[PDB]
Structure 1
Amino acid sequence: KVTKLDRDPASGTALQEISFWLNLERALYRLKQALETVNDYNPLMKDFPLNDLLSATELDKIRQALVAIFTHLRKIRNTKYPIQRALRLVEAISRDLSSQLLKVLGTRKLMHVAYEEFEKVMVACFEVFQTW
């Protein structure tokens, strides 16, 4: 039941997958193959930094959040995560990065501001895109 539970990575946000792979480990600590799978995958799941992205309001904060996330993606070498699953994770980061972007531009109200301020905020946003 608990040992047979699995989740499609193509759906949901990234935080849902982080919460799944953390609380599955915590419930398994409370069978052998599931244990070694989550023990293999737990170096990725620990201290994952996308709460910085979700808490970011300024574009430079977003940019340092994605470089923190991508530098956290270095640790594939010690785990045996599925590669298509990893692609669905980085697709999920793209998803809530987009969501935070429409949130930020909803605060910014680009059409109701002058040309110059719109220019600096969108070249900052395109710097974020280039960094991505």
Structure 2
Amino acid sequence: ASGTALQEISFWLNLERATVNDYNPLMKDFPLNDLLSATELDKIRQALVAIFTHLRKIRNTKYPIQRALRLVEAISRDLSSQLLKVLGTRKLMHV
């Protein structure tokens, strides 16, 4: 529950550089960084679809369900933070 999905994928890669083979397809190339990098709300939803497409790889892995659920919650936390970030610039009251 502690830490973002970006931290989780890096930690799994670090464990691979120290289980990991079974979850390697899922952690091969997550697009969570792309969602964080995007400053456009339309790009963020498109990036979210890509993150879910990468998550589909869980079927061909031995990943427990609860841990992938926790990763989903971390993704949601990052999404909420990024949505607040992009909304704060627009000054919704003034427009």
TM-score by length of 2: 0.94
Q: Secondary structure at the match of 2:20?
A: helix
2:29 alignment counterpart? 47
- Give, in angstroms, the shift of residue 83 of structure 1: 0.3
- Specify the structure having the higher radius of gyration (Cα): 1
Runs (4 or more) in structure 1 with deviation over 6 Å come to none
Q: Displacement, 1:11?
A: 1.2
More moved, 10-19 vs 95-104: 10-19
Q: Pairwise mapping of residues 1-132 of structure 1 onto structure 2 (< 5 A)?
A: 10-27=1-18, 37-112=19-94
Superposition deviation, residue 108 in structure 1: 1.2
Cα separation, 2, equivalents of 1:109 and 1:46: 38
- Distance in 1 between residues matched to 2:6 and 2:33, nearest whole Å: 9
**1:18-64 deviations in Å (ceiling 9; x for gaps):** 1100111022xxxxxxxxx1110111111111111011111110011
1:111 Cα shift?
Answer: 1.0
Q: Distance in 1 between the 2:26 and 2:68 partners?
A: 11
- Once the two structures are TM-superposed, the CA of residue 76 in structure 1 deviates from its matched residue by 1.4
What's the secondary structure of 1:40's corresponding residue? coil
Gaps of 5+ in 2: none
Distance 1:22 1:108 in 2: 37
Distance in 1, Cα, partners of 2:22 & 2:42: 33
> 1:77 Cα shift?
1.7
With CA pairs under 8 Å and 6+ residues apart, which has the higher RCO, 1 or 2? 2
Q: Structure 1: which 5+ runs fail to align?
A: 1-9, 28-36, 113-132
Partner SS for 2:21: helix
Distance (Å, rounded) in 1 between the aligned partners of 2:88 and 2:62:
40
Distance 1:87 1:51 in 2: 19
SS in 2 for 1:39: coil
Q: What is the SS of the residue equivalent to 1:80?
A: coil
